[PDB]
Amino acid sequence: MSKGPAVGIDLGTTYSCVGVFQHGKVEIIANDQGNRTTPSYVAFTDTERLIGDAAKNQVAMNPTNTVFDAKRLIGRRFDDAVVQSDMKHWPFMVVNDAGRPKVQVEYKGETKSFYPEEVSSMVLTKMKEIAEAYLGKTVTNAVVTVPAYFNDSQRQATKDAGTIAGLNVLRIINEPTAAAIAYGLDKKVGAERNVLIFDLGGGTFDVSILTIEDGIFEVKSTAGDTHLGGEDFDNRMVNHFIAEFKRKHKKDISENKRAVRRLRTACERAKRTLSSSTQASIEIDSLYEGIDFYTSITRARFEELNADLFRGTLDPVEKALRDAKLDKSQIHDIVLVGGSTRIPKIQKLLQDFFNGKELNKSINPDEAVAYGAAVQAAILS
Amino acid sequence: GSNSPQEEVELKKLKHLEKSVEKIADQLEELNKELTGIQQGFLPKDLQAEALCKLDRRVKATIEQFMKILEEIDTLILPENFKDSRLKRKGLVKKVQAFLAECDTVEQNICQ
Ligand SMILES: O=c1[nH]cnc2c1oc1ccccc12
């Protein structure tokens, strides 16, 4: 194959995304399974190594050997408070190798350990291959995104993942800087601009404030919740339904893992529908003890169940404004990133906070970081 | 009668899921044939346990495929007037659940 262009890669916690700027526009690249985003998952079986969709699809069958969340470990010391707290919730083993964390799994019958950058290099290799398959050309150059709060070690470990994957890392850029680039906030004429990025998706919540003067970016503050995302909104919905099935049929489905999974999956789908509709219907045949579960949820019911979590998204915004020494009136632009920003209430809450100021939401929230990185990749090539 | 063209779309979705369930049921049948094979075969009692346990990944993959079928059936919204689609969906769910119960039987008698 001939030489290809430079790509933008958003190396996410749960999902990664690759984009290419060509023909004067960004094209998000769909993978082999036709998905625009790919799970940041690596699975080790008795016969092979699986990446992305294939690794995520067999997680129920091989939980201890299916690695995800490597971004949460990348560039960190084993004894880091974050490593120790996250370890409890992972099905896979995390071991200490001379102060460094390593994921421990069984690969082809043997016990093997991998550094977080080696796992992230497998995910980047897949993103490199996703781009090569679409373009029909060899892809080497890329811009890789990292969160604004990443330290020297976390940023180097990400650049190392790129190197291991056979990538030439043009630049490592902040995820909120990438989202600002996507909206051309660095091209607007005028005085310096204060930008607030509201990133709610991929299991993390990140609020960043940036200042842009003559195309120069400065991170003024970063705030958020490490473990807040869409899954938390799903749990509330599931709890509501379990409570409902108890009220209606006087039966507890919660100790049946298959009933709870069927209900959870239906809730994730109903949540998505409620972002564009005011009501979502669910029909689950023989959910538990032969009982058919035909129900519905209104957008107002979903908002109520999640009222505290949704409201709580503004605390990080206030904390970021305090740290950046800025008043909410000093923010020129607000940018929505992450799938959970599609939730109409979150949008209403945030716009009301900024006294009716319009939000930058036209680019898919999931693809906005990869969009900016793809633009940057084109600029640097 | 009152049969609608719209329902033909839903019955076609159900017919594909029925064919998919048949494909997984054949995997469960091959596992059953294999499981009996190790049990009634030439392997010594010790070697049998290890061989039966090697079928764990496959039983688990069979269970997972059925679960994914269930999750796809659960995405259907069939109005009250689509009587034939509601019957096909219910019959298919019950069919999958009975196969799932067979899978649990396999799973409980291997890797012990
Ligand atoms: O992650 C999401 N949260 C809430 N609504 C949606 C999310 O992804 C979507 C994709 C399409 C439509 C709605 C949503």
Contacts of B50 (CB under 8 A, 6+ apart): none
| Domain count of the fold of chain B | 1
Taking the C-alpha atoms of residue A189 and residue B51, their distance in angstroms, rounded to an integer, is 71
Taking the C-alpha atoms of residue B33 and residue A77, their distance in angstroms, rounded to an integer, is 50
Taking the C-alpha atoms of residue A314 and residue A128, their distance in angstroms, rounded to an integer, is 37
Are A282 and A293 in contact by the 8 Å Cβ rule? The answer is yes
**Domain span at B30:** 1-112
Among the partner-chain residues B63, B70, B89, the one whose CB lies closest to the CB of A262 is: B70
What are the tokens at A287? Answer: 């959910």
Taking the C-alpha atoms of residue A78 and residue A81, their distance in angstroms, rounded to an integer, is 9
**CATH class given for the domain over A1-67+123-187+361-381:** alpha beta
- Read off φ and ψ for residue A247, nearest 5 degrees: -60, -45
Which of A58, A48, A46, A85 lies closest to A69, judged by CA? A85
Kindly report the CATH number assigned to the domain that includes residue B21. Answer: 1.20.58.120
List the domain boundaries for chain A. Answer: 1-67+123-187+361-381, 68-122, 188-228+313-360, 229-312
Q: How far, in Å, are A289, A300, A358, B75, B89 from residue A275 at the CA level?
A: 32, 11, 18, 17, 28
Taking the C-alpha atoms of residue A40 and residue B16, their distance in angstroms, rounded to an integer, is 31
B interface toward A at CB cutoff 8 Å?
57, 60-61, 63-64, 67, 70-71, 73-78, 89-90, 93-94, 97, 100
Query: In this structure, how many other beta carbons lie within 10 angstroms of the beta carbon of residue A300?
Result: 12
Inter-chain contacts counted by CB atoms under 8 A, chains A and B: 45
Taking the C-alpha atoms of residue B40 and residue B84, their distance in angstroms, rounded to an integer, is 44
Taking the C-alpha atoms of residue A155 and residue A145, their distance in angstroms, rounded to an integer, is 9
In 3-state terms, what secondary structure has residue A73? coil
Q: Does domain A68-122 match CATH 2.60.120.10?
A: no
Query: In this structure, how many other beta carbons lie within 10 angstroms of the beta carbon of residue B88?
Result: 20
Q: Is A53 exposed, middle or buried (0-12, 13-18, 19+ CB in 10 A)?
A: middle
Task: Find tokens 């957008």 and name the residue.
Answer: A299
Are B68 and A65 in contact by the 8 Å Cβ rule? The answer is no
Contacts of A41 (CB under 8 A, 6+ apart): A50, A51, A52, A55, A56, A59, A66, A67, A68, A123
A229-312: CATH topology is: Actin; Chain A, domain 4 (3.90.640)
Domains A1-67+123-187+361-381 and A188-228+313-360 share a fold: yes
Pairing of strands A193-201, A333-337: parallel
Task: List, in sequence order, every beta strand (DSSP E) within A226-357.
Answer: 279-288, 291-298, 333-337
E strand or H helix at A56: helix A53-57
Taking the C-alpha atoms of residue A186 and residue A177, their distance in angstroms, rounded to an integer, is 9
Taking the C-alpha atoms of residue A242 and residue A260, their distance in angstroms, rounded to an integer, is 8
DSSP character string of A341-356: GG-HHHHHHHHHHTTT
A358 HSE (CA, 13 A, CB side): 3
In 3-state terms, what secondary structure has residue B79? coil
Which of B77, B72, B63, B106 lies closest to B92, judged by CA? B72
Contacts of A295 in chain B (CB under 8 A): none
CATH architecture type of domain A188-228+313-360: 2-Layer Sandwich (3.30)
Which of A19, A57, A60 lies closest to A363, judged by CA? A19
* A56 Cβ below 6 A of ligand 1: no
CA angle, residues A80, A82, A87, in degrees to nearest 5: 100
Resolution, expressed in angstroms to one decimal = 2.5
Among the partner-chain residues B67, B89, B97, the one whose CB lies closest to the CB of A261 is: B67
Exp. method: X-ray
What are the tokens at B6? Answer: 């719209």
| DSSP 8-state class, residue A30 | P
Taking the C-alpha atoms of residue A376 and residue A74, their distance in angstroms, rounded to an integer, is 23
What dihedral angle (degrees, nearest 10) is formed by the CA atoms of B69, B75, B80, B86? Answer: 0
